[PDB]
Design a protein around this ligand. Structure first.
Ligand SMILES: *[C@@H]1O[C@H](CO)[C@@H](O)[C@H](O)[C@H]1NC(C)=O
Ligand SMILES: *[C@@H]1O[C@H](CO)[C@@H](O)[C@H](O)[C@H]1NC(C)=O
Length: 536
C-alpha cells in the first residue's frame, strides 16, 4: 500500500481487502465487492454444504462484482429491459459464493445497523450484482451498512437426495447462512453492528428469510426480518423429501445417470447440462412452480413451514411483510396461453379454465371448479378483461397474497410484532404493459432508492416516495418499527393483528390504513382449499 486510498483498506478474517470509492447522488460511499466467504463449491464439492473460505495472502481486490451462480438465463423477450434487468450481469460460474458490502464513506464512527439483502428468482436464478440491488443509495442517504450475498440456485443449490451424504439438500440456504455468520464475525471491521442485523428479501428471497426464522441455527444470526412478496409456507417454496428425491433421480436420468454413485455421476456433468434439463422434472404443466427448492429434510427445516409457524414462539420477532398490487400478472406471460406482453391479453372463459389448471397444478377437478366459481364474476362470466384479471388474481392469491396473509396471522397470533403493507405504485419507467399493473419485483427499485439517481428519469414524486420507503425500511432495521419517532402523525403505521388486521398502502399519497388482507378470499385458499384437496 502507500499510495492507495486509506479509507478503502479493511481486514477480514480471511485477509486484507481493497474496496472502491463510489459516487452516489449526494456523496461518496465505500464499496467492497466480491468478498469470497466460501470455498468454491466446484468439482467434488458440487451439491455439498459450503465450507468457509480459506484465508488468502496479500490484498484481495474487492472493487468489482464477482461471478453469478450458474443458472438458467431468460430469453422469452430478447433485448427487452423488463426481462434483461433480472438476467445475470456477470459471468456464470459455479465458483460464485461471494458477497458485497456497502457502507458510508468514510466508514461509520459508531456501530451501524446492518441490512442483509437476499435476492429472489425462484431458487433457480438471481444475483446480488443486479442494478436494482445497488446498495449505494441506502448507504449514502441512510448511513446503512448493506450486505448482499450470492447463493447457489437451481440444482447446484437445491438438488437433494434426502438422507444422503453427498446431496443433503438446502445447501443454497446453507450458503446464505454462512454469509450470515461471516457478517457476525466480520462486519464490525466496516463499522457494522453485528447486534443489529436485519434480513430482507423478495420472492424466493422472502421465502429464504422466512426459513432462517424457522431454523434454529440461523436464529442467532439476525434480529429482525423483512419479507417482501414471499413466504416459507405456501405451494412453491418447499418440497417434501419424497418429491425432492423423485425430481433428483428423474433429472439424473435425463442427463444420463445407490445415492453415492448417482451423485458421483451428476458431479461429472457440465453445469450447463444440468441447467438444460432442470425444467423437465416438474409433475405438471405449471407456472409459479420451480423444480429445485428448499426441501423439508427434518434438519435445516425440522418440519413443514406450516407446522413450524403453527407451533412456534415468535415473541422475540419483529417482522415487516408485504405484497404488490399485482403479484400474479408477471407469471402469466411465462406459460398461460392467451397471455402476452405485446397485446392486451384479453382471454376467453375457456382459456381461463385452462389457465386455472396451470396456475393451480395440484388441483383435482372439483378443486379447480371451486377456484373458477370463486373467481368468476357472475354478472359478466364471459367478459375477457375480467377473466384476464381473475387469472392474474388466482395466481397472485394462491402463491403470495394468501400465504403472506396466513403468515402475518400466525406470527401475530404467537408473539411476533408484525407490520404489513400493500405496495401500489407503478413505476413511471416500467416497460411491461399496463394490464400487468404493479408486477412482482417492482417495489425493489424504490426500497433501494434508485429513483434518487438523476440519470434514471424517475419523476420528482417518485424520488420523494423512494425516500419514504427507504425511511420505513431503515427505521424498521434500527428499531423494529417503520415509524419515524421524530416525524409525528403521517399518520402512523399500526402493527398487524389478528383482531384488527390492519396494513398500510404504499403509493404516492400518504400512508392509508386498511383492514383485512384479502380476508374473504384467503379463507378460501387457506381454510377451505386444503380440506377440499384432502377429501378428493
Ligand atoms: C396475444 O398474443 C398471444 C400470443 O401471441 C395470443 O395467443 C393471444 O390470442 C393474443 N391476444 C389478443 C387479445 O389478441
Ligand atoms: C432519460 O431520458 C433522456 C431524454 O429522453 C434519454 O436520452 C435517456 O436515454 C433516458 N434514460 C433512460 C435510461 O431512460
Amino acid at each position: 500500500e502507500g499510495r492507495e486510498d486509506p479509507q478503502l483498506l479493511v481486514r477480514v478474517r480471511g485477509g486484507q481487502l481493497r474496496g472502491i470509492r463510489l459516487k452516489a447522488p449526494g456523496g461518496p460511499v465505500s464499496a467492497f465487492l466480491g468478498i469470497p466467504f466460501a470455498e468454491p463449491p466446484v468439482g467434488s464439492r458440487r451439491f455439498m454444504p459450503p465450507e468457509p473460505k480459506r484465508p488468502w495472502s496479500g490484498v484481495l481486490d474487492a472493487t468489482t462484482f464477482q461471478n453469478v451462480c450458474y443458472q438458467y438465463v431468460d430469453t422469452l423477450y430478447p433485448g427487452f429491459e423488463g426481462t434483461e434487468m433480472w438476467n445475470p450481469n456477470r459471468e456464470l460460474s459455479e465458483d460464485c459464493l461471494y458477497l458485497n458490502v456497502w457502507t458510508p464513506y468514510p466508514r461509520p464512527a459508531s456501530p451501524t445497523p446492518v441490512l442483509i439483502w437476499i435476492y429472489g428468482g425462484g431458487f433457480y436464478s438471481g444475483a446480488a450484482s443486479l442494478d436494482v440491488y445497488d446498495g449505494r443509495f441506502l448507504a449514502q442517504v441512510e448511513g446503512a451498512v448493506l450486505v448482499s450475498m450470492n447463493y447457489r440456485v437451481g440444482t447446484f443449490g437445491f438438488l437433494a437426495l434426502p438422507g444422503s451424504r453427498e446431496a443433503p439438500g438446502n445447501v443454497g440456504l446453507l450458503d446464505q447462512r454462512l454469509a450470515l455468520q461471516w457478517v457476525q464475525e466480520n462486519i464490525a471491521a466496516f463499522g457494522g453492528d453485528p447486534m443489529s442485523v436485519t434480513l430482507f428479501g423478495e420472492s424466493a428471497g422472502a421465502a429464504s428469510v422466512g426459513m432462517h426464522i424457522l431454523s434454529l441455527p440461523s436464529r442467532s444470526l439476525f434480529h429482525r426480518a423483512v419479507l417482501q412478496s414471499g413466504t416459507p409456507n405456501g405451494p412453491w417454496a418447499t418440497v417434501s423429501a419424497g418429491e425432492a428425491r423423485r425430481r433428483a433421480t428423474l433429472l439424473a436420468r435425463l442427463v444420463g445417470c445407490n445415492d453415492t454413485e448417482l451423485i458421483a455421476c451428476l458431479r461429472t456433468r457440465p453445469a450447463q447440462d444440468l441447467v438444460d434439463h432442470e425444467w423437465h422434472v416438474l409433475p405438471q404443466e405449471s407456472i409459479f412452480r420451480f423444480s429445485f427448492v428448499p426441501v423439508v429434510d427434518g434438519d435445516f427445516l425440522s418440519d413443514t413451514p406450516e407446522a413450524l409457524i403453527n407451533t412456534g414462539d415468535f415473541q422475540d420477532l419483529q417482522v415487516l411483510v408485504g405484497v404488490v398490487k399485482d403479484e400474479g400478472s408477471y407469471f402469466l406471460v411465462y406459460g398461460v396461453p392467451g397471455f402476452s406482453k405485446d397485446n392486451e391479453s384479453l382471454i376467453s372463459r375457456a382459456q381461463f379454465l385452462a389457465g386455472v389448471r396451470i396456475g393451480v397444478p395440484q388441483a383435482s377437478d372439483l378443486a379447480a371448479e371451486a377456484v373458477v366459481l370463486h373467481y368468476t364474476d357472475w354478472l359478466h362470466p364471459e367478459d375477457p378483461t375480467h377473466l384476464r384479471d381473475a387469472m392474474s388474481a388466482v395466481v397472485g392469491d394462491h402463491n403470495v397474497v394468501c400465504p403472506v396473509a396466513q403468515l402475518a396471522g400466525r406470527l401475530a397470533a404467537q408473539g411476533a410484532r408484525v407490520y404489513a403493507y400493500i405496495f401500489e405504485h407503478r413505476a413511471s419507467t416500467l416497460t411491461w404493459p399496463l394490464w400487468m399493473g404493479v408486477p412482482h419485483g417492482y417495489e425493489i427499485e424504490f426500497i433501494f432508492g434508485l429513483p434518487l439517481d438523476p440519470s434514471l428519469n424517475y419523476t420528482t414524486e417518485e424520488r420523494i416516495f423512494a425516500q419514504r420507503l427507504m425511511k420505513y425500511w431503515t427505521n424498521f432495521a434500527r428499531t423494529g418499527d417503520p415509524n419515524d419517532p421524530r416525524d409525528s402523525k403521517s399518520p402512523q403505521w399500526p402493527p398487524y393483528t389478528t383482531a384488527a388486521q390492519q396494513y398500510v398502502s404504499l403509493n404516492l399519497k400518504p400512508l392509508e390504513v386498511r383492514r383485512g388482507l384479502r380476508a374473504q378470499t384467503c379463507a378460501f385458499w387457506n381454510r377451505f382449499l386444503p380440506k377440499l384437496l384432502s377429501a378428493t
